[PDB]
């Protein structure tokens, strides 16, 4: 295997493919990148067994076919450490790979390419293309609501659903939930799959905000996304994900509308004096007014009064202020609508001028 290529043509690919690597976790081989030269193309692959990130680079200079694996971090650091505009010549020398540039020489240890983990072949059952920004909006709008290390591992991921002419994402940890849907102009079969937490992050990080669209392929046990010269593929999580339709409040008759930023800043200041453990704050809703209060064990107290639009009945309701702030931070709109029922029922929050995304938060008891 042999190839010479510009430093800048390797940086992004190396950065992207090193994404699935959690340092030196499982097998030693997983800390290595798979290098393969076939045709006039160099392929780089990083994996963690659960997912895989593949980069393809055009080889305009002379090359020889072959494959091997090398330590990801070191190879990347070497390439990054070389001067800008540097030509990097790489050649496999038996058990080691020689990297040369200018008067800099590096010999890296290898591991048989034949032993590099690879996701078994699978077949896609659903395919569609959509703008990168759309996939970005979908993930960002709900990512913060995925569970982290919950026993019900199926919650430690994000649901991706194709329904009608829309793609939807759902995330929840049992206390709060986020759902968002966008139209892709393509008639799609009804399908639902759970993407592992790390896959969601990798997918998100894989977007360059470019104009080039994203090609998504979904199978019974895998999901794949092609962006430019990168191909990401991840296994899916098994288990029945809760139905957001069953979680959305059934009778949120009381509707409060307020400026998202004044609301966020008020909750932010009040949170300072909330219990560090439970983060509870109290909301007192009255005609066109919202009063937010917080107190902690040492009996300190925060009180915020805001003008809002509300004509319903008076009520008090508690919430984990972090869950509320997470929502207001994700909405980043002008005004938000809070739809309540009672003090022991969840609340649905959403942009006052858009129902494409909805958030559900269970109140706290106190």
């Amino acid at each position: 295997m042999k190839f010479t290529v510009e430093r800048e043509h390797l940086l992004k690919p190396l950065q992207q493919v090193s994404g699935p690597l959690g340092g030196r976790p499982t097998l030693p081989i997983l800390g290595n990148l798979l290098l393969q030269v076939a045709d006039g193309t160099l392929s780089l692959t990083g994996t963690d067994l659960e997912m895989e990130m593949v980069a393809r680079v055009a080889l305009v200079q002379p090359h020889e076919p072959g494959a091997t694996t090398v330590p990801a971090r070191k190879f990347f650091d070497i390439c990054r450490g070389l001067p800008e505009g540097a030509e990097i010549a790489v050649q496999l020398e038996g058990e080691r790979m020689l990297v040369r540039s200018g008067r800099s020489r590096f010999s890296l240890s290898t591991l048989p390419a034949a032993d590099f983990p690879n996701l078994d072949d699978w077949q896609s059952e659903v395919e569609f293309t959509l703008p990168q920004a759309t996939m970005k909006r979908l993930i960002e709008a709900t990512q913060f609501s995925m569970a982290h290390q919950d026993v019900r591992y199926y919650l430690n991921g994000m649901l991706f659903e194709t329904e009608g002419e829309e793609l939807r994402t759902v995330a929840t940890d049992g206390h709060r939930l986020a759902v968002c849907s966008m139209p892709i102009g393509q008639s799609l079969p009804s399908h639902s799959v759970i993407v592992p937490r790390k896959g969601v992050i990798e997918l998100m990080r894989m977007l360059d905000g470019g104009d080039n669209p994203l090609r998504v392929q979904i199978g019974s046990n895998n999901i794949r996304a092609h962006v430019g010269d990168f191909i990401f593929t991840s296994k899916l999580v098994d288990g029945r994900f809760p139905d957001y339709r069953r979680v959305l409040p059934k009778n949120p008759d009381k509707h409060l509308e307020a400026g998202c930023d004044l609301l966020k800043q008020a909750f932010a200041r009040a949170a300072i004096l909330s219990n560090e453990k439970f983060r509870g704050v109290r909301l007192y809703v009255s005609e066109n007014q919202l009063k937010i209060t917080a107190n902690n064990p040492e009996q300190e107290e925060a009180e915020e009064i805001l003008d809002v639009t509300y004509s319903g009945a008076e009520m008090e309701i508690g919430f984990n202020v972090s869950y509320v702030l997470d929502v207001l931070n994700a909405l980043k709109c002008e005004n938000v609508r809070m739809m309540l029922t009672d003090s022991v029922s969840s609340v649905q929050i959403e942009d006052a001028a858009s129902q494409s995304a909805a958030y559900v938060v269970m109140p706290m008891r106190l």
Partner: peptide, 6 residues
């Protein structure tokens, strides 16, 4: 304390 959606 905290309530659960499901």
């Amino acid at each position: 304390g905290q309530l659960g959606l499901f």
